[PDB]
Amino acid sequence: MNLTVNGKPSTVDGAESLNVTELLSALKVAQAEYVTVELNGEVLEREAFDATTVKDGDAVEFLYFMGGGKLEHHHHHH
Known part of the structure; x- marks a missing residue:
């Protein structure tokens, strides 16, 4: 189904009806x-x-806001 994501005229192959929750999981x-x-x-x-x-034929805007300038720890263990 066709979905304008953030101004992108894209389409998710098939997808038999998805709610906003499923759009969040689809984009992950x-x-x-x-x-x-x-x-x-x-x-x-x-x-x-x-x-x-x-x-089909709608527009879901997914924001990538926030992040972090220092997350270095790394889950390394012997």
Whole structure:
């Protein structure tokens, strides 16, 4: 189904109806409880991801905000 992601006229091969939650998993966000995204401009609330089902011919805007300038620890152990 066709989805304009952040101005990108792209399409996810097939995909039989996906809600905003499934769009978050499709694009794969790590902070599922802190993710901030909108669709066609309208921003989703912490609990609006599930109920809002998305379909062909829509626009999901996925923000990559925040990050960090120092995360060096590395899970190395012998």
